[PDB]
């Protein structure tokens, strides 16, 4: 009853892992809960308020009682508990997030972060600032190599090395890089793994 709201919150955190697990991974997190954590923050503010109040009270009334210690001990733990929840949730949220910023940006010619992440505005803007700052953070890693990467893609090794892509209602032709593949619905291109990696992440290509 004391710290249990955090147990319920992480209990809810669990279900997003369930949605990232088997899964199938489309992202589409329901929302970030600002309300329930606001409840948590009001509860914890309550706590630390009574804490500094009693911290004033030992200075006068309690007179360093053996019992007093407990309040600064036990209730202190509760603060930690909320923290233990609040970060555990939060890191989970960053884990479901940064990976998404990994596997697709997105990809050639990124060329900008847009239309991605169906959560969009529904997810908190505090995370989105972190996010845009994070893909800005990875643009520098993109700019060191020079390898080249091409890192966001090709988690799965090339074979061999030409494939066949069957158009999937995409228009097209938007293939400007390397060559004008001239995208055309109902058209399969006997194209090398090279531009396939880049174009398959967008949603144009279908069968590898």
């Amino acid at each position: 009853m004391y710290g249990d709201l955090g147990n319920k919150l992480v209990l809810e955190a669990k279900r997003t892992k369930q949605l990232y697990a088997r899964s199938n991974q489309d992202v589409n997190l329901p929302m970030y809960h600002e309300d329930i954590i606001r409840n948590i923050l009001k509860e914890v503010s309550n706590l630390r308020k009574n804490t500094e109040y009693l911290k004033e009270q030992q200075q006068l009334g309690m007179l360093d009682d053996k019992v007093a210690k407990c309040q600064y001990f036990v209730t202190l733990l509760c603060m930690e508990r909320n923290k233990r929840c609040l970060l555990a949730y939060q890191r989970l949220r960053t884990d479901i997030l940064d990976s998404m910023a990994w596997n697709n940006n997105g990809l050639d010619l990124m060329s900008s972060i847009t239309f991605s992440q169906q959560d969009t505005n529904n997810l908190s803007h505090q995370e989105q600032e972190y996010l845009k700052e994070y893909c800005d953070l990875i643009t520098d890693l993109k700019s060191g190599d020079l390898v080249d990467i091409d890192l966001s893609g090709s988690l799965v090794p090339p074979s061999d090395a030409f494939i066949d892509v069957r158009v999937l209602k995409d228009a097209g032709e938007i293939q400007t890089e390397y060559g004008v593949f001239n995208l055309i619905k109902d058209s399969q291109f006997f194209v090398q793994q090279s531009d396939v990696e880049r174009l398959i992440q967008q949603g144009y290509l279908q069968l590898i």
Binding site: Y2, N7, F73, V74, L77, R84, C85, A88, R91
Partner: protein, 159 residues
Amino acid sequence: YYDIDDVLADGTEFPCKFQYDIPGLGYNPGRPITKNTKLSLPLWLARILAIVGPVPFVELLPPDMFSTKVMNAIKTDPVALDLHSINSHFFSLAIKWIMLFSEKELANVVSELLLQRAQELNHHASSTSTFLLKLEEMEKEIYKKSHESYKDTKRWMFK
């Protein structure tokens, strides 16, 4: 810690009675809590109250889950025993309580139970039925990981 299983593991209630009186009850209008009151506490706070004292603040009365009836029943047929009903956390939990109370006796017991489940879980690692329903949450997670390695290695086996 950050993983959900641990922070959820700390959420479980234990029957721990107070060694001492503590006015300023945070649970309601006592105001103090009379000595030797039996109050259920989650593990997170109760964990370091047994250490800090040279007499500790709490007795640590053994949880109903660890009742010697149970620790006996798990020595018969673990494979048919239902863990998911009792807690459901066991290994995530029991691992803490074995260190907290520093009990040697049951190590040899649970160290056995977990082999006996697993010699069964390599059996459902091959491609459920009812059984998948009675695993402990964390154990269950390992079942995902194994079943996925197998499934993926089979899907690689052909085309």
